[PDB]
Structure formats: structure tokens, C-alpha cells
Amino acid sequence: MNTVPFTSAPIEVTIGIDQYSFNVKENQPFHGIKDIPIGHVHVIHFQHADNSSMRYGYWFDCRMGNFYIQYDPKDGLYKMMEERDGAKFENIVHNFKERQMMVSYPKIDEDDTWYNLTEFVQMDKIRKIVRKDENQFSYVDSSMTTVQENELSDPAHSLNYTVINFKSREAIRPGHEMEDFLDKSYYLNTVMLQGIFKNSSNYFGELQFAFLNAMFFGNYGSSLQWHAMIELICSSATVPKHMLDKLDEILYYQIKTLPEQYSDILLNERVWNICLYSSFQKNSLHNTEKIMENKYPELL
Amino acid sequence: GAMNSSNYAELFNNDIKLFVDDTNVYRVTVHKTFEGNVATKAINGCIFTLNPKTGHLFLKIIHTSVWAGQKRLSQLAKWKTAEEVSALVRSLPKEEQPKQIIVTRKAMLDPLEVHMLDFPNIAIRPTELRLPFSAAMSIDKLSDVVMKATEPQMVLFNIYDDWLDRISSYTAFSRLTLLLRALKTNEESAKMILLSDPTITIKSYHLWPSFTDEQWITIESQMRDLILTEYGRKYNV
Numbered sequence A: 001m002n003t004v005p006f007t008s009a010p011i012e013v014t015i016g017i018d019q020y021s022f023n024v025k026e027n028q029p030f031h032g033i034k035d036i037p038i039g040h041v042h043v044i045h046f047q048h049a050d051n052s053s054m055r056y057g058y059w060f061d062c063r064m065g066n067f068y069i070q071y072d073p074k075d076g077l078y079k080m081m082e083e084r085d086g087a088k089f090e091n092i093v094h095n096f097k098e099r100q101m102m103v104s105y106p107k108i109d110e111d112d113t114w115y116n117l118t119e120f121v122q123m124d125k126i127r128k129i130v131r132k133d134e135n136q137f138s139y140v141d142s143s144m145t146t147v148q149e150n151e152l153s154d155p156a157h158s159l160n161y162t163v164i165n166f167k168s169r170e171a172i173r174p175g176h177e178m179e180d181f182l183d184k185s186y187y188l189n190t191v192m193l194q195g196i197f198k199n200s201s202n203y204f205g206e207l208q209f210a211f212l213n214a215m216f217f218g219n220y221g222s223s224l225q226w227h228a229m230i231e232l233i234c235s236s237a238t239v240p241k242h243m244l245d246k247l248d249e250i251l252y253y254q255i256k257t258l259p260e261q262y263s264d265i266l267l268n269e270r271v272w273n274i275c276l277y278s279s280f281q282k283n284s285l286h287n288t289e290k291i292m293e294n295k296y297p298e299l300l
Numbered sequence B: 001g002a003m004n005s006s007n008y009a010e011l012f013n014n015d016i017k018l019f020v021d022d023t024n025v026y027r028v029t030v031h032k033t034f035e036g037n038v039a040t041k042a043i044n045g046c047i048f049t050l051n052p053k054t055g056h057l058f059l060k061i062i063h064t065s066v067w068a069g070q071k072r073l074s075q076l077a078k079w080k081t082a083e084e085v086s087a088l089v090r091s092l093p094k095e096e097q098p099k100q101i102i103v104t105r106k107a108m109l110d111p112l113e114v115h116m117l118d119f120p121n122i123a124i125r126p127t128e129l130r131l132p133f134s135a136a137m138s139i140d141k142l143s144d145v146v147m148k149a150t151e152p153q154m155v156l157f158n159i160y161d162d163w164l165d166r167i168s169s170y171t172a173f174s175r176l177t178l179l180l181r182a183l184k185t186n187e188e189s190a191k192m193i194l195l196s197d198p199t200i201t202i203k204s205y206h207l208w209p210s211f212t213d214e215q216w217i218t219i220e221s222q223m224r225d226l227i228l229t230e231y232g233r234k235y236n237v
Ligand SMILES: COc1ccc(Cl)cc1CCN
Pocket: A005, A006, A007, A068, A069, A083, A092
């Protein structure tokens, strides 16, 4: 288990780490988060009390460095930093643990929620979507736009998700117009899976990262992308059987982790009522159809 | 966006545009089988593609052989329509290609958009107008060429005959839609109005009768009455 020390907490803020969050008061003696499970990416997220506008945070892998948080009072945000003195860091952490100034990552032993939400998410793939290669961690916030959003403005601050457009020459073979539009298997299997993502693991990684960005920050471009990646699968008549079963598990844990209060705004009616009830794969998502109907019977 | 009453003069400006009506593409007669079931038999149809400024009509005849062995024919008919309109555009010299295509039924939007991806500058638009182009098969000479086709075929007409020698495009389109609205509302009476006169004739190279200007006013008024009289008939007024 790894630790992310904080230099202090000078402004009142709700701090999250993955699905947990807690309120820190202004100048409360908070010096970070300990017992972070090794083996997964993590995200440490922030929402200032005095301006809930702008949620932001950092995707990181404790295996890739020693990372701390320092409040920046000029830029007004909690910044992630890498600490050179390897044992400066260990001595920094040991001092705060001894004074019990850290919160413990509160992982129940039965609980596979975080693994299930990040199964296919790897730091290496995150860093290609979020382009800032001088740090080992990636910043994301509520307002960052995606590349496709930018085509329909600053490119360095972009989320470089793979563009998916169902009425595009990439999506439609000359002379298979009706076939490819009504059955997106070509676009899924040949264009996206074989050509761009190389395999379904990378596809699911981006899908899961898109969901987590939209859920944790309110990133609209991310929600768009999540919806699109689900729709492209569900609207394909020909999907490998292992992908359908895995997609069902992926979505099951998402819709279920997704606090109910965010569902009214995050979930797109045309994207989902199609996937469950009209698409080629309407019968292939048993678990996912069982969680939405159980908790959302008003919908149908 | 959508074409409606508010932006109606745009039809007669100098930007090439086409209306596309797919109503008559897939035409069937529903009938009973020996076993007491129901089946369809298709008959020849047509795409009605019309330049409202010039009156040029690209009548693509849809021969029943295109449906042989196909399924979901109502759905296919929209994509076949879109394929043939796209082929027409590609066949035209660049300076003749439309800048806008207005579909008369909104279900044509996605099929035509997909078939026209190679033409990102051609706007595909719906319309909120109820246009009576379904009645094109009430024009005897169009109906004749469609039913006699033994193979796919495109036939070119000027649906305004020679009217643009005497009236504007706006007025010609108004005359056309009135005539077609009358034929759609009461085909029999509309044709009686157009043809009961043993002194009036259709030129060999025309679709409609050769009316003097004054006779057209009489005809147009008789068509208006027909549409109003039929309105009272169907709605009890
Ligand atoms: C005094 O320095 C520190 C105190 C606390 C924390 Cl988490 C980090 C540092 C590292 C400063 N590079």
C-alpha cells in the first residue's frame, strides 16, 4: 500500500480518492491519504467549498513514482507533485503517519468495486488521452473538451479520445451505405478494434476512463464518448462473445457505482433505450438490464 | 435547417436545389393468397426529383425487379432512393450539382446524408411543408412511362411545360402544387376539370393542356373550389 502526503490543506475542500470522499475544513491538520492499494490506477479529486464550480483531479499509479499534493495559492488549486529525495519522501510520510495526520483508504476486503471500474484502465493509455508528458500523472477537470468536441478550443488541454462518428466516411464503406449504417460491425470490428484500438482491452480501457471522467468531474465530452462506445457495440450485429459478456459486467458496475442523483443528468435516453430494448445486443446485457430496471423502473 | 412558409422564396433564388419525394418508390397492391393469407405484389415506382426553379424533373423509374428477393422493402426503398439521388448528383457536371437537397419526408434524411458523404457542401434538408408530389402518378404521361418500363430508366421532363415563358418560377410552382393538390384530393374531378373540354389539347411534348392565360385563371379557380368542396365533404362543413 502507498501514500500521497499533503503539505497542508489551506482551503476548505471536498477531497476524493476513487469512490471515497471526505470534507476537509480550512486549515484543518490534514496531511494526506495512506494505505492506497497498489496494483490499480487511482484518481484523487477536489471540489472547493467556496466554489463548487470546477471539479478537478489527478490520475496516478503509485508504482510510477512518489507523488504528494501542494496547494498553490496563485493558481488556486491542489497540485500533484513528484518528490526527488526517495527517502525525503519516506521520511515525510513516516513523520505524518506517526502523528496520525492521514486518512486511510477505506477498502473493504470483500469489495471489488474499484477493480471492476478500472479493470482495463492503465496509466499508459490514460497518458495518450491526456497529453502532458512531463508528469507521470494526468490532470483532468470538469471543463476540458475532447478532440471531437473541438472539431464541432485549446488543443493542449484536450481529452484525446478516439473520434466516433456514425455518419462519417470512416464509419461507412462506399457501396455498403445501408449495411454499414444499420449494422455497425465493420466500424466496430475492422475500423476501431482491429485498426485503431488493436484489441478490446484498449477499447474497454478508454470506455471505462471516459465513464470515470464524466462521473467524477462532470466532463460532458467524456459522457458523450462513453455513450458512443456503448452504442457502437450494441448497434453491431457481430460482436465477439467475450466482448459482450465483458461489456455487461463493465456496465453493471458503472450504472451501480453511479450515485442515483447524477443518473438524471448523466444518462442519455436515446443511447440507452436503444441498447437495452432495440439494438442487436438488446438480449446480451442481462446483468446491466437487471441493475437499471431494478433501480430505475420509472424509466420503463 | 428546415424549409417552411417563412423561408419559401428561397426555392426560387439562383442556388441550385432539388426536392426529392420518395412516396411512389415502393408501390404495392395488398391481396389474399389461396390459403386466406395476405401478400403484396409490387408495381413499378419512381423517384420524383424536381428543380423548383427550372421545372426540370429527373424521374427515376424504379422497376419491380429491384425488389426481387429483398427484405424489409419499405426500409430498403429509402436507401435505394438515396443511392439513386447520389448517383444523379455524381452524374451531373459540377456547376449543375445542387447546393441543397430538400426531402419531402424526414425518414429520407439519414439515408440521403449517408449516401452523400462525399458531398459535404450539399445541404440535406427536411421541410415542414405538406407538398402534394405523391400525386405525380396522377399525371397521365408520367404514370404511363413508369408502368410501361421493363427495366430501370431515368426520364427527364419539364413539369412546367412552357409556363416559364409567361410566368415566374414562383407562380409556376404555385400552379403546379395547386394542380397536384387537386389531383391528390379528388383525382377524378381534377382530371374532369383538366380534360372534359373537347376543344382543349395537350401538346405531344407537354404534360398539361395548352391553356391560354385566361383559361388558366378559370382552371385554377376550379381547382381551388374542388379543394375547398372536398374539404367540406371529408370534414362535414
Ligand atoms: C517540507 O516538504 C514537504 C512536506 C510535506 C509534503 Cl507532502 C511534501 C513535502 C515535499 C516538499 N518537496
